[model samples]
Target chain A: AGKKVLIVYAHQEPKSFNGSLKNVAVDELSRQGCTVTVSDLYAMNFEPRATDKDITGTLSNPEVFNYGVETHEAYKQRSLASDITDEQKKVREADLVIFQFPLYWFSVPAILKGWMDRVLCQGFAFDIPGFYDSGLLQGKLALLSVTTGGTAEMYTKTGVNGDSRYFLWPLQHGTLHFCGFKVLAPQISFAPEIASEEERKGMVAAWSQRLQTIWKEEPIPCTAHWHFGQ
Target chain B: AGKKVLIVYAHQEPKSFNGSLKNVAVDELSRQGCTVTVSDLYAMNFEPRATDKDITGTLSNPEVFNYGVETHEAYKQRSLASDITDEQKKVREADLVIFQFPLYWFSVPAILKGWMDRVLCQGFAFDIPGFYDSGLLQGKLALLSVTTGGTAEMYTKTGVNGDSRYFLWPLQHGTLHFCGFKVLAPQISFAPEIASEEERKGMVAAWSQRLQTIWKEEPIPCTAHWHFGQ
Candidate 1:
C-alpha cells in the first residue's frame, strides 16, 4: 500500500479523456496509500527531440555524434540534462510505472516516445550484455494504459486494423521487456471520442477499479507468440 | 522517371550511415530524372508536440481537446500551422515518400513520429469513411528505409527479438496502408555500428543501386498474414 507509482502522461489537455484517466489513477492510488508522481510531458513542455543538448557536459567524441553512445556515456558520468535525470530518479523510486496516453499512428504519442528514447539511456535501462530478462530494471513493473480513436471491433484479427496486440510488440516486448520491466497486459480504452459521456466515465471508473487490485496482478508472458499469435 | 520524391530524413549527424543512405537516394533518384526533396528533420528542428498551437484558428471544441477531431477540422478549414501545411503540400505533390531513420525503440524517432502524427491528420491523410483502400493518399508509394542496432540474426523468427516483421505491423499495416499508400518492402540495414568500414560502404552502395530500379519494385501485401506468419 505504501509502494511508489509513476505515471508518464503525454496528453496536451488536462480535461481530455486521457487526462481524466491519469487523474483517476492518481486519486485512486493516493487513496490506497501509495505515493504517485506524474510526469506530464506537455505541461512541462518536455523536449521530444533527442540531440546533443541532452548531454550537458563535454562531448565524448567531438568527431562523431552517436545518440545511443553519447547518451549512454552521459548517463554514466551524470552529465545528462536535469530533466532526464529527474525522470530517471522517479523511475528508480517507483515500484510500478504506468504510461498514460492516446494512441497516435498506432503507437504512443511522440512526446512519450521521446521520454523512452532519452530517459531510458543504454547504461540506465540496459547494457550490451544485460537486456531482456537480465535488464537493469528487472524487478519493476510496467503497464500501458492507452486510449484509441478506433473501435475494439476494428482492431480484431480479421478486422481492418488487425489484432490490437500486433501493434503492442514494439512497446511491450522490444522496449519494456527488453529493459526488464515485467509488463502487465495493457488497458486499452477504445474510441472515447465516439463514446457517450457515460461510457467515457465508465471507462475511467473501470481503470480505477482495476487499480484497486493492480498489485495482485501477474505479468504477462512477453513473448513473440504471445504478441503475434502464430 | 519524371516523378517527384520526398525523403523525410531523421538523423542527428550528416556523417552517419543513415545520412549516407539518404544522400545516395537523392543522388540516384536525381540521376534517374526524378525531382528529389529532402526534409532533414533534425536540421529543421521540427516541433513534435501536437497541441492547440497546431490549429491557427479557433478549435472545434475548446472545452475538450480531441487531437484527431480538432486537427481534422483544422485541416479542412486550412487553419493548421504552416509547418504542417508545408509538409502536407510536399506530400501532395510527391509521387513517392521515403522515410529514412535509425530504429529507436523498434519504431521511428519521436520527431519523425511527430511528423506523421501532426502532418497526416484526419482530413489530410484519411477520413472517417475514406481510409485503407479509399484513403486520400491512395496511389502514392511509401517506403521505410531503416537502420538497426541489432544484428540480422537477432531479428529472425527464432532469434532474441523474434522476426523483424513482427515490429512492422503498426507502421506498415496500421499507418501507411490505412492511409492508402502502396507500402514498399523495407530496407533494414542491420548492426551498422558494429559493421566494418567496407561493410558500411557496401550497404550504402547497395541502397544506391537499389534506388536505380526502385520504380520496378512492387508493394508488399500489407496484411496480418504478411506481418505475422500463419
Candidate 2:
C-alpha cells in the first residue's frame, strides 16, 4: 500500500478563516498522491474532558481508583467505537501523521488535546520504562500544521510575544518527540484571520509543496535522546 | 479602603504541591494587610467548559445575562444559578488580580481559561470600536504564580522544554494585557514535586516577599503592539 497519512483536525466554526485553511491542507494532501484520512474532532463531537466513568470503572463502577490503567482500556474501547480503531490501524500502517489546528491561546484547542490524552494511551502509543526509551509506535513521522491570529514578529524574544519558538517546544519535543515520532518542521500561517486572499493562497501553495516534499524526505530526529539516554 | 486583591486560584487538589503555593500566597497576602478575596475555583465547583446556554442566548438576551454583574449579586439574587457568570465587578473592584495555579500542558488549566472566556465578556472588557487599542481594564495589575514540575533550566530558550517565555506571552500579553491589566513578571517555582524540604521552605519565603512587593509594582507593556499594531 502507498504511504498512509492521518490528519487529526480541529476547528470550531467551519465557515471561519481557520476552516478555509483546513480545507486547503486536505485538498493539497490528496493531490500529492497520499492516501489521507481526516479526524474532524469537533464534528465528531469528541468530548474534550474524559469522564470519571471512563477512568475509574467500566462506565458502571464508581469505587475504583485504578483509573490510570482503567481509563486506558475505556479509551481504547471508545476509539474502537468511533472508528478510531480504523484510524489507529491506519496509524500503524501510515508513514505520516499531520496535526491540523488553529492555535488557541498558544496551544491546541481543548478537544484536540483531549484526543492526545485519550487516543495516545498506555501500551499503544507508549508504555513503561522500556517503551519510553524504545516503544511500539516508532519510526512514524508527525507534523503540526497551525494557524495563529498573531503575526511573525510577535513571537520573537525581543518581539511582543517574547519568543514564538518557545511556545511550540513542549508540543514538538515533550509530547510528539517524547513518543518517539520523527517530527517534521511545523508550518505556521501567522495573522491568519486578516490575511489577504492572495497571501492566504500563497500559504496554501507553500503548504502543499511542504507536504509533497516531506513525504519523500527523511524525518527529523526525535529529541527524546537528549533527555532519557536512549 | 484597603487595596482589594482578587486571587483567581485554580487547583484540582488543594493538597497537591501547587495547592501549597496557593495557600502560601493567600496567607502572605492576609499577613501583608491586603484585602484579599480568594476564588478557590475547584472548591467553588467552577465548571471550566462553556455551555450552549451561556453563549448564544446570553449573547443575544441582555435580560438573561445582566443579573450577575458582580460576585455579590450572584451570591444574593440566586438568579445566578448557572455555574458560570459574566460579572466584571470582582475584577473591577480589585487593584490587583493574581492568577494562582500549576502550569499544566504549558498553559493555564482549562477552568481558569473558562473564567476568562466567561467573566471577561466582550463589551465589559472591550469594545469593537477601540479594537483592543484602548484597553478597558488598563490600570489593573495581574500576576501569574505557577508551579512547574520541570526545573527553570528546562524552560530556557535552548533547554529541553523549548521556550517557557513563549508559552507565557499569550497569558502575559494576549489575554491579560489585551484587557488592559498591568501584567507583572510571573512567579514560577521549578521542580515542584522533587524539590527538597529546604527548597520548598525557600519557595514559601520568596512568595511571602512577592505578595507584599507586587501590589506596589507597575505592569509591563503588552507585546501586542509589536505583533499586531501601533
Candidate 3:
C-alpha cells in the first residue's frame, strides 16, 4: 500500500486523452497512499536523442562510439548526464513503473523510446550475463498503458492490422522482459480520439478501478508463444 | 540507374561499423551514377520530439492539441518548422530511401523513429483512404540496413530473441508499407562489435556489392505471412 510508482508519460498537450490517463493514475494512486512521481516527457521537453552529449565525461573509447557500450560504461562511471541519471534514479526507487503514451507508428512515441534507450543502459538495466530472467531491474514491475489511433476490431488476429499482440513483442519481450521487468498485462485504450466523451470517461474509470486492485494482479508469462501464439 | 537515394543514417561515431556501411552505400551508389544524400542524424542534431513548437502558425484548435491531427494541418498549411519540411523535401526528391542504423532494443533509435513520426504526417505520408496499397508516397522505395548487438543464431525462430522478422514487422509493414514505400530485404550485420576486423570489412564490402544490383532487386512481399511464418 505504501509502494512507489513512477509514470513515464509522453504527450504534448496537458488536456489530451493521454494527459487524462496520466492525471487519473496520479489522482488514484496518490489517494491510495502510494508515493507517485511522473516524468512528464513532453512538458519537460525531454531530449529524445541519444548521442555523444549523453556522456558528459570522457568517452571510454574516443576512437569509435558504440551507444550500448559507451552508455554502459558511462552508467558505471557515473558520467551520464543528470537527466538520464535522474530518470534512472526514479526507476530504481519505484516498485512499479508505468509508461503512458499514445502509440505512434505501432510503438512508443520517440521521446519514450529514447527514455528506454538512454536510461536503460547495460550496467544499469542489464549486463550480458544478468539479462532476461536475471536482469538488473529484477523484482520491479512494468506496465504499458497505451492509447491507440486504431479501433479494437482493427487490431485482432484476422483484422487488417494483424493482431495487437503481434506488435507488442518488441516492447514486451525485447526491451522490458529482457531487462527483467515483470510485465503486467498492458491496458490498451483503443481509439480514444474516435470515441464519445462517455466512452472516454468509462475507459478512464476502468483504469482507475484496475489500479485499485493492481497490486493483487500477477504478471503475464511474457513468452514468444504468449506474444505470437504459435 | 540514375535514380536519387536518401540515406537516413543514425550513429554517433563516423568510424563505427554503421558509419562504414553508410559510406559504402554512398560510394557504390555514386559509382553507379545515382545521386545520393545522407541525413546524418547525430551530426545534424535532429530534434526528435513531436511538440507544439513543430507548428509555426496558429493551431487549428489552440484549446486542444492532437499531434497527429495538428501536424497534419500544419503540413497542409505549410506552417511546420523548416527542419521538418526540409526532411520531407528530401523524401520527396528521392526515388529510394535507406535507413542505416544499429538496432536499438529491436527498433530504430529514437532519433530515427522521431524522423518517421514527425516527417511522415497524415497528409504527406498517408490519408484515411490512401493507406496500405493506396498510399501517398506510392512510388518511393525504402530499405533498412541495420546492425545488431546480438548474433544471427540468437535471432532465429528457436533462438532466444525469436526470428528477426518478428521485430521487423513494425518498421517494414507498419511504417514503411503503410506510408506506401516498397520495402526491400534488410541487410543485417549481426554482432559487429564482436566480429573481427576482416569480418566487419567483409560486411561493408557485401553491402557495397549489393547496392550495385539494388535496382534489379524486387520488393519483399510485405504481408503478415512473410513477417510471421505459418
How much lDDT does each candidate structure score? 0.93, 0.64, 0.92
> Native-vs-model 2 lDDT?
0.64
Per-model DockQ:
0.86, 0.15, 0.86
**Clashing residue pairs, backbone N/CA/C < 3 A, model 2:** A155-A164, A166-B163
lDDT of 3: 0.92
Cα-based lDDT at residue B31, candidate 1: 91
The digit string of per-residue lDDT tens for model 3 on A51-169 reads 88889888878887777778888898999999999999999999999999999998999999999988899999999988889989999999999999899998998887888988898
Q: What is the interface RMSD of each candidate, in Å?
A: 0.8, 6.9, 0.8
In candidate 1 the C-alpha lDDT for residue B141 amounts to 98
In candidate 1, residue B8 scores what lDDT?
A: 98
Model 2, B1-230: lDDT tens digits are: 37888889876555666677778777877887878888877677565433334442223334233211322233334333244442357787888898987665566655576576556644556543332347688777888988875688877655756445655666776678767777887888887667888988898788877776776676655563332223
Write down the TM-score of every candidate: 0.99, 0.72, 0.98
Worst lDDT run of 10 residues, candidate 3 chain B, spans B127-136
Q: Which ten residues in a row have the lowest lDDT in candidate 2 chain A?
A: A221-230
| Angstrom error at residue A220, model 1 | 0.3
Q: How many residue pairs clash in each candidate?
A: 0, 2, 0
